[PDB]
Amino acid sequence: RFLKVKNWETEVVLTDTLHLKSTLETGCTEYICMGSIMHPSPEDVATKDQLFPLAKEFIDQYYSSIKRFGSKAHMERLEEVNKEIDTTSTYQLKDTELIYGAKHAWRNASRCVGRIQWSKLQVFDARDCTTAHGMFNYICNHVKYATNKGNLRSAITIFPQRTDGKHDFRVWNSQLIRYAGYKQPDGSTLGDPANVQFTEICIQQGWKPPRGRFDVLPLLLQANGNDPELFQIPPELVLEVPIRHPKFEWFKDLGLKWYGLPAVSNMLLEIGGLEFSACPFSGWYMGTEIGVRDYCDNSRYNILEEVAKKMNLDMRKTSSLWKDQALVEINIAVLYSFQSDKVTIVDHHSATESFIKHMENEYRCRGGCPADWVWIVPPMSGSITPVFHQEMLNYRLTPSFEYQPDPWNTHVWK
Amino acid sequence: CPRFLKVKNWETEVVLTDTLHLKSTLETGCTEYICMGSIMHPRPEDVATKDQLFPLAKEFIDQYYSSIKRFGSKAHMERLEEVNKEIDTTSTYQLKDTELIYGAKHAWRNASRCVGRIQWSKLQVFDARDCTTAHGMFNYICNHVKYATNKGNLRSAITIFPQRTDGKHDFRVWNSQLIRYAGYKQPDGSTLGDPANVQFTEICIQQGWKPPRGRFDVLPLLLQANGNDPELFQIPPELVLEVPIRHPKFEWFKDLGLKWYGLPAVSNMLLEIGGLEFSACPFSGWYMGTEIGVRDYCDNSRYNILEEVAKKMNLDMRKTSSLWKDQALVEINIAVLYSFQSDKVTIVDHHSATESFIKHMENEYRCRGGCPADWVWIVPPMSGSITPVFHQEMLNYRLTPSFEYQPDPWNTHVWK
Numbered sequence: 001r002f003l004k005v006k007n008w009e010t011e012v013v014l015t016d017t018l019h020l021k022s023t024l025e026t027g028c029t030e031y032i033c034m035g036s037i038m039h040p041s042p043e044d045v046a047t048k049d050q051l052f053p054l055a056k057e058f059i060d061q062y063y064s065s066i067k068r069f070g071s072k073a074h075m076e077r078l079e080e081v082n083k084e085i086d087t088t089s090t091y092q093l094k095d096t097e098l099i100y101g102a103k104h105a106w107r108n109a110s111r112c113v114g115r116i117q118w119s120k121l122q123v124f125d126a127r128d129c130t131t132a133h134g135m136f137n138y139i140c141n142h143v144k145y146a147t148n149k150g151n152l153r154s155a156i157t158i159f160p161q162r163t164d165g166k167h168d169f170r171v172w173n174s175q176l177i178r179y180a181g182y183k184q185p186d187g188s189t190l191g192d193p194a195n196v197q198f199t200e201i202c203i204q205q206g207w208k209p210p211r212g213r214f215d216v217l218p219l220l221l222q223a224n225g226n227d228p229e230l231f232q233i234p235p236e237l238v239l240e241v242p243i244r245h246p247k248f249e250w251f252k253d254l255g256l257k258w259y260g261l262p263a264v265s266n267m268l269l270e271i272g273g274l275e276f277s278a279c280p281f282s283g284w285y286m287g288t289e290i291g292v293r294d295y296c297d298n299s300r301y302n303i304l305e306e307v308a309k310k311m312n313l314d315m316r317k318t319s320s321l322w323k324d325q326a327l328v329e330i331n332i333a334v335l336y337s338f339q340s341d342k343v344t345i346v347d348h349h350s351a352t353e354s355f356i357k358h359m360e361n362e363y364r365c366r367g368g369c370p371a372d373w374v375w376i377v378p379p380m381s382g383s384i385t386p387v388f389h390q391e392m393l394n395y396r397l398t399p400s401f402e403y404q405p406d407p408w409n410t411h412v413w414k
Numbered sequence: 415c416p417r418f419l420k421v422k423n424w425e426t427e428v429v430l431t432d433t434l435h436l437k438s439t440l441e442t443g444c445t446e447y448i449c450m451g452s453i454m455h456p457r458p459e460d461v462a463t464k465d466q467l468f469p470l471a472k473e474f475i476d477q478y479y480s481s482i483k484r485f486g487s488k489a490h491m492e493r494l495e496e497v498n499k500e501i502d503t504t505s506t507y508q509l510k511d512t513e514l515i516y517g518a519k520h521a522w523r524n525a526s527r528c529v530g531r532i533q534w535s536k537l538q539v540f541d542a543r544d545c546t547t548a549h550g551m552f553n554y555i556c557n558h559v560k561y562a563t564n565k566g567n568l569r570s571a572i573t574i575f576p577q578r579t580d581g582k583h584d585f586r587v588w589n590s591q592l593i594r595y596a597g598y599k600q601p602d603g604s605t606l607g608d609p610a611n612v613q614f615t616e617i618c619i620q621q622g623w624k625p626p627r628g629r630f631d632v633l634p635l636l637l638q639a640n641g642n643d644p645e646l647f648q649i650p651p652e653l654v655l656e657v658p659i660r661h662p663k664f665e666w667f668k669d670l671g672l673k674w675y676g677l678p679a680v681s682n683m684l685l686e687i688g689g690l691e692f693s694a695c696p697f698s699g700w701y702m703g704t705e706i707g708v709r710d711y712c713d714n715s716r717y718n719i720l721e722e723v724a725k726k727m728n729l730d731m732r733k734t735s736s737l738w739k740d741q742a743l744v745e746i747n748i749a750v751l752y753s754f755q756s757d758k759v760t761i762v763d764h765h766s767a768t769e770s771f772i773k774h775m776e777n778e779y780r781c782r783g784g785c786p787a788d789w790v791w792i793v794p795p796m797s798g799s800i801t802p803v804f805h806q807e808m809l810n811y812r813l814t815p816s817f818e819y820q821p822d823p824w825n826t827h828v829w830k
């Protein structure tokens with residue numbers, strides 16, 4: 001059936017036909033919705049039998065996308081892929097298909113509010129990599145290219161695909177650039193509390209921790225299933241921003257900084273039945289990712305109390321909304337600081353406005369846009385952004401970015 | 415479906431285990447391949463047949479007798495037999511007062527979109543199934559309003575009018591909420607009052623209401639009894655408790671002339687108990703501050719005051735990245751909570767309400783085996799991630815007894 005989505009502020013109604021193309025499951029059933037579950041449901045590798053239909057599906061939509069469906073090039077590619085799955089139990093993507101597949105994995109990422117940019121993605125083919133040193137080189141080049149002296153450029157680097165599940169390429173870092181976290185003797189936590197465990201895996205592997213509040217973690221890189229190896233990203237490649245406030249001259253005295261480059265490195269890229277377990281990708285930040293989640297989550301840097309102190313807010317009762325007041329000022333500071341240093345950043349009003357425009361484009365040219373309201377709506381000021389009022393349909397299209405197990409729970413050491 | 419489903423809180427790491435979803439009785443709108451969790455709403459004489467009614471009543475009666483620890487008793491079997499004979503001879507049945515009260519409280523308990531459910535067992539149930547006329551409905555509703563308002567010490571309550579029979583004799587409150595402000599569309603395209611209520615205000619004017627044409631005019635009740643044409647009544651103004659909005663720091667905030675009413679009372683939902691349909695069942699609680707301060711005042715299509723407050727705050731309004739909207743939104747919500755607390759009118763901030771809801775949810779998982787919750791509605795419309803519900807995974811499913819949406823009565827009424 002055709003499904004309708006309505007915006008309750010503008011009364012615009014869009015008609016979704018694209019959902020008819022999905023064949024992967026959401027986790028919901030007719031009687032139970034799992035729309036707020038974060039992850040709904042080494043031997044698990046494909047077979048020649050499961051692989052050819054997935055390959056055929058992907059080749060078909062690629063040749064349909066360049067408007068040469070059923071062409072001679074299309075026929076030959078399908079046959080070519082057939083023989084290769086036969087004689088090798090897998091196949092290799094053409095460069096054009098790799099690029100198309102990575103852009104469409106972004107385009108299909110229902111949790112990403114930034115997708116208006118999906119077709120402007122620089123794709124770095126790293127499928128010839130064999131060692132952790134090679135991975136380090138490729139990642140440095142990615143970081144330098146994507147950072148671009150503050151004029152951030154979206155990029156993805158794609159390492160060799162899974163073969164037997166015993167020779168996986170993995171970036172063990174969850175993001176390329178993150179700050180360490182240290183469990184203190186007295187029980188509290190220095191640095192980023194989200195990374196205490198990963199920080200300790202780096203220390204346990206030989207990393208000498210400076211034990212500061214903003215220590216960039218080393219890279220921990222696993223190539224071809226071997227034990228991971230540590231590398232220090234050269235500091236001149238890591239662009240950082242001191243956080244200050246346009247009105248509160250005391251804000252700089254908090255000593256806060258953050259990095260300019262958000263770069264997810266723990267997801268799996270699926271294209272045509274092939275699995276790329278190492279595919280770091282990076283864009284630029286929406287301000288609330290830093291100012292709301294990173295700084296103000298109770299399990300993260302958790303700075304609301306200090307800022308509200310310096311603002312001299314009444315903190316005895318919640319109904320003073322002292323937390324909400326400090327939250328806004330922290331996010332003003334983040335946006336001001338990146339903008340003052342000419343580092344790309346987008347505020348949640350502009351970002352969600354762009355996403356509504358993006359949805360309009362996709363419904364017109366593509367017949368829909370899968371979208372996860374729970375993730376699209378920003379973590380502050382929700383209903384004064386236009387996505388709060390926008391009905392969204394969530395469904396799974398391939399190529400896609402998927403979650404995968406943490407490497408330290410699966411890797412057999414040597 | 416699997417027998418145990420787990421939900422995790424990503425801030426505290428608490429895992430809870432849900433078995434109550436096995437009792438879900440109606441459709442969410444989702445399928446295996448598409449999730450409709452952000453969709454807001456996923457014939458008259460089509461009424462329950464005898465064959466449809468028998469099992470729905472048994473399921474409810476079984477549930478009631480299980481709750482009073484009398485499952486399988488002589489009184490349980492006799493009540494089943496009595497109900498079955500009633501459906502046999504009359505095609506319907508009547509609930510006992512105990513069952514009506516249990517059913518209404520559980521429809522609230524089951525309301526997955528409601529963050530206020532820690533209170534569900536403290537609900538005053540007014541049985542109005544003897545009502546026959548719109549004048550009688552007005553009396554019952556006035557009594558409800560006075561009871562629930564309680565001079566500012568608000569008490570949750572529901573008034574239940576006669577159930578549906580053949581669908582041509584429905585009781586309905588045409589108002590979507592018992593207390594709302596009129597909205598007036600002007601020839602130049604602007605709106606005075608509450609823009610959300612323009613359509614209903616026009617209906618009232620057509621029915622004979624003389625509109626004062628102000629910014630905060632309480633709408634009349636438009637009340638339909640036994641399927642008759644609806645009739646207009648003015649709520650006595652001394653029963654409508656109102657709060658002028660001022661700010662603890664900004665002396666100029668009172669000069670905006672804003673006020674709101676104290677009693678949130680939903681009157682357009684259908685209460686379903688054991689297959690019986692109560693099409694007029696107004697229920698009321700107390701406000702969470704963001705319902706007024708974020709939605710009523712700051713939605714672009716409502717009173718839309720962010721600009722005017724931002725101006726009086728002397729904010730930079732040229733770039734969105736100054737977050738002038740967010741800054742003014744917090745101050746408006748501070749004013750709303752301060753004005754209600756100062757006048758001793760019950761209100762709950764979004765921090766306190768979501769923390770209570772988490773405690774309620776954990777208790778329900780422990781004692782009941784789960785708690786259906788709609789994250790999209792439970793998370794407040796401002797400061798989402800600094801409330802504990804943001805990080806709480808939730809399962810949404812539909813249990814009965816339940817509050818359900820129903821068609822707007824002006825779209826279905828057959829005018830006499």
Ligand code: HEM
Nearest residue numbers: 106109111112113114117154155281282283284285286401
């Ligand atoms: C270019 C600017 C971009 C912006 C402003 C942006 C914005 C966002 C935000 C705010 C989130 C939520 C993140 C979280 O809460 O953890 C997100 C998620 C996501 N983004 Fe984007 N993004 C951008 C680029 C990209 C790119 C280049 C890719 C891939 C090629 C991508 C793929 C994804 C995916 C897969 C998720 C889901 C993450 C998860 O499930 O944990 N994004 N994005």
Ligand code: HEM
Nearest residue numbers: 522525527528529530533570571697698699700701702817
């Ligand atoms: C006692 C204090 C209460 C509080 C603080 C509270 C809070 C809320 C809030 C904030 C909403 C969302 C409203 C919206 O965004 O439109 C809501 C929805 C709802 N509440 Fe509660 N509520 C309370 C009492 C009640 C009572 C007494 C009932 C029924 C007996 C009830 C049943 C519902 C239902 C069915 C919804 C969904 C409404 C819809 O879908 O439009 N609530 N509640």
Ligand SMILES: Cc1cc(N)nc(CCc2cc(CC[C@H]3COCCN3C)cc(F)c2F)c1
Nearest residue numbers: 175178261262263264281282283284285286289
């Ligand atoms: C390409 C891109 C652009 C953009 N603007 N943002 C992102 C996410 C970035 C990002 C996200 C996260 C979230 C990690 C955990 C937090 O707990 C909830 C589950 N979540 C997975 C951490 C980072 F350190 C980071 F950098 C990616």
Ligand SMILES: Cc1cc(N)nc(CCc2cc(CC[C@H]3COCCN3C)cc(F)c2F)c1
Nearest residue numbers: 591594677678679680697698699700701702705
């Ligand atoms: C019992 C109870 C307690 C409490 N705290 N809140 C409520 C909701 C009250 C309430 C809700 C609404 C929402 C109206 C429309 C707007 O379009 C989006 C969907 N929505 C249905 C309007 C009111 F005027 C009102 F008063 C009920």
Ligand SMILES: C[C@H](O)[C@H](O)[C@H]1CNc2nc(N)[nH]c(=O)c2N1
Nearest residue numbers: 388389390391452453454790791
């Ligand atoms: C499109 C979306 O479902 C819609 O805007 C919802 C979002 N969440 C909400 N949550 C509450 N409590 N009330 C609402 O009216 C809404 N609106």
Ligand SMILES: C[C@H](O)[C@H](O)[C@H]1CNc2nc(N)[nH]c(=O)c2N1
Nearest residue numbers: 036037038374375804805806807
């Ligand atoms: C429980 C819920 O699914 C979880 O807290 C989600 C809510 N929405 C989110 N939205 C974004 N963008 N990022 C997140 O990490 C989350 N967390």
Ligand SMILES: [Zn+2]
Nearest residue numbers: 028033444449
């Ligand atoms: Zn769903």
